[model samples]
Target: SAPAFPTGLSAVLDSSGNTANLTWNAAPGANSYNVKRSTKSGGPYTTIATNITSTNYTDTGVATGTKYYYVVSAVSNGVETLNSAEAILQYPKLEH
Candidate 1:
């Protein structure tokens, strides 16, 4: 069986319009992580990154005014576990 899935995933805008910082719980038995993102909730997600050894990620190049949904999974040996809870992020709506 694979190692336990990651948890406590969070996504926040780290830059004014183009960066998002993600953080999540670390899985002890896992050596790396895979980060996924979607434009809509509950993902038809795309893998944004892989082989990430840190518990956090800095995502740049995000589009303004669009919501991004994210989740993370742990990689144990060569296998990837199920995804963590979804986290959402978006650039500020500055038009108001």
Candidate 2:
């Protein structure tokens, strides 16, 4: 049998300029989604969040002058697959 994975990936915004809401299509046998994040693009990421459902996640803790990159992968039975897609996010720039 093959490993279960997430598919039909998608994302959204929970709050404007400060936070973002993420969503995706649920996998058939996926237990949860492994959320990863990075400060740089295409980077060595860390597991910032995990076990997400309802196809939506909120990114809080966003700091000024910092850009955040995110990706979500399907996790099942201790096995995690590759990321569904890449999401490039950054904190809003202040007006001069």
Candidate 3:
């Protein structure tokens, strides 16, 4: 059987706005997770990370002032569930 979708997915941007910290609530019976990223919201996201055992992922390759979108999927027993709620992060310019 397919696993339930993940919940409470969230993203946080660092002071430099280039790094993103993503977290999510665990799904029942999930053995691993796949993380996807995209420049557009509602995107054509590409999988950046996979087989993640933890509920958190750190993305450190984003450009400042650009919005990034992310989604996560739970995998269990060779079955992959649907994506979680989308999370977005953007690095804002620092004020002088």
TM-score for candidate 3? 0.87
Candidate 2, residues 1-96: lDDT per residue as tens digits?
767556554434333556655666776667788877788888787887887765667767666446677778887777887786677774334568
Q: How are the candidates ranked when ordered by TM-score, highest leading?
A: 1, 3, 2
Task: Name the runs in model 3 displaced over 4 angstroms.
Answer: 90-96
**C-alpha lDDT (0 to 100) for residue 23 of candidate 3:** 92
TM-score of each: 0.87, 0.72, 0.87
Q: Pick the candidate with the highest lDDT.
A: 1
Candidate 1 lDDT tens digits, 37-95: 99899988999999999999988857865789999999988888989989988543455
How well does candidate 1 score on lDDT at residue 54?
96
lDDT of 3 by residue, 1-96 (tens): 456878888877888677898999998979999989888898888999999999999988777677889999999877889998898775435689
TM-score-better candidate, 2 vs 3: 3
